[model samples]
Target: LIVNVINGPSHDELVALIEREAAELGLKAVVRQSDSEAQLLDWIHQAADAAEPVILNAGGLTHTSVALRDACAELSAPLIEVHISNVSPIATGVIVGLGIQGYLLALRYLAEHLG
Candidate 1:
């Protein structure tokens, strides 16, 4: 399954964009926003446990949270890091300096790889 586990409550439009784009390619995409670091951590575990691929944009945590980084490193499925602006440099495959459509691009990468 394709998923985005994010922070902030206001990304519904981005969620819709990703879902719509993935759907067009016959991939099921779901977006979930977390209210706290703990919640985000929980979802990271959930994704890893379910073997779901994640396209992550970890906000400021991109530079600071080692626990989050460590959790992500254990994922069995692909992990594509996305940023609207440049930030961290350790992304498995990064789509930086791109707008929100960068997510759609990453989604496409996952879709093609899965097929």
Candidate 2:
């Protein structure tokens, strides 16, 4: 299975961990990071169109951005929201306050359910 990991800003540091975890789970993780809301939305739209599960860490956008929430709602597959810090809508599940490991945990969850 393929998982789209859309990260916002500072969360980019978790990419390697997420990739390694996905590999261990025998899944492909398409991870991307951007500070731009438009870029983030575009990736969300692509994931929606591809019908792939998503693990998102939308940073500040989590508390704001109705457009991001709305776009995420369009995902036909599971949407797992991850946060390195403790932190909401349109998510199939959420992992927060576990640091960067939250991304790995999200990958594991998706692998079991979708792989």
Candidate 3:
């Protein structure tokens, strides 16, 4: 699952574009145009139920929302942190700031999940 929690006011189009590209790779994308903590938690429940690894494209909250971090930590499904633009070159670098190519990384990883 790819969750695009876009930050900027006009980022919806970018998010949609990314999701469309992800679909081309055969991955499902869930867009939660949410900047709300409550709604995010709700989606977490839904994602958790699906039993697949989820890539949380958590926008600005990657910096502040410890609750979201903790919520993700509680889930059993592997959680991936995604960012289109590189988060490196920052004081706090992204552990996995996967660009559009992150879809490939996700694909590579999911290849191991086949039963």
Candidate 4:
């Protein structure tokens, strides 16, 4: 199975860690970063269409974008929303305050359940 990691604020540090964790878990993971809401939405839509799980850190758009929330609602596969500090629209699950490891945590969850 494939997992799509979508970031809105460009968390550069998490890219390698996420890829490593996903590989260790034997999952195909793709990390995409962009500050543009449109780009983020496109990725989300792509995941939705493909029925691939998503791990998202929408950053500032988390609370501000209803469009983002609605797009997430359409996801056919699981959606795990991650936050570095603290913080949701209808994620399959949410991880917060665990720093970037939250992405790995989310990946692990997907690995076990979706693997």
Candidate 5:
């Protein structure tokens, strides 16, 4: 299952762009925006139904949402955490933002799923 861990309350443009990219890549994709733990948890549970690959563009939550982090860890998914911007330096914020290529890097890390 392809997913995005939207920021609290979520954003629209990112959703549109990602959906477009997914379509271009011919990958099944879905986006779930969350304003609170309950909302995010709902998506996670929904995703649990399939063991397909997972991706998270979890917005600023990467900085402060331990709950979100734990939720992801709790899942058995082979997750590919994603970002629209690079975060290799790790100093931009508490949680280094992943560059747009974060998903590409993730796919590389999970070599078996690249196909």
Candidate 6:
């Protein structure tokens, strides 16, 4: 699962791009996008509950949402934080400043470690 923020403002393209790249790696990317706090939190909880590895790019909420951080912390599986700006210290691994390739990089980690 890839929990992301793709609401309006033009980030859906990146989601599509990451989806394509992830598919090429033979990983099924469940790219979940939302700007709503409720929706985003729901996605995070779902991933955590499933114990599935996640590549999370929570937009600016990375700083503001303690709820998000807490939910992500509950994840028993790998949690890879993907950031174009800052990194998440709580993440098992952090990918920063790598643009959309961060998703591909994360996919690689999942493939290598989980597969």
TM-score of each: 0.85, 0.89, 0.57, 0.90, 0.56, 0.77
Residue-level lDDT of model 5, residues 68-113, one tens digit each, is 6666555555655555655411211222256544544443444444
Q: Model 1 segments beyond 4 Å from truth?
A: 5-10, 87-90
Give the Cα lDDT of each candidate. Answer: 0.75, 0.85, 0.52, 0.85, 0.53, 0.70
Q: How far is candidate 2 from the true structure (C-alpha RMSD, Å)?
A: 1.9
- Quote the positional error of residue 78 for candidate 2 in Å: 0.9
| TM-score of candidate 5 versus the correct structure, residues matched by position | 0.56
Residue 54 of candidate 5: its Cα lDDT? 56
Candidate 4: C-alpha lDDT? 0.85
> Which wins on TM-score, candidate 1 or candidate 3?
1
Could you tell me which 10 consecutive residues in candidate 1 have the lowest summed lDDT? 1-10
Q: Which of the numbered candidates is closest to the native, going by highest lDDT?
A: 4
Candidate 2, 5-108: lDDT as tens digits: 88887635566777778888999898887778899998999988999889888777888999998898888899999888874477889899998788888888
> What is the RMSD, in Å, between candidate 3 and the native fold over all Cα?
5.5
Error of 1 at 103 (Å): 0.6
- Number of the top-ranking candidate, with TM-score as the measure: 4
State candidate 4's TM-score: 0.90
Model 6: per-residue lDDT, tens digit, 10-115? 1668777767876776666777667578877787788778777778776667677788788878887787877765444578898889877777788888877872
lDDT of 1 by residue, 1-115 (tens): 4665354222667788888888897788767777677777788788889888888877778778887887787678887887776643445687887988788898888888872
lDDT of 5: 0.53
Cα lDDT tens digits for candidate 4, 65-102: 98888888889989998888874568888899998788
* lDDT of model 5 at position 64: 76
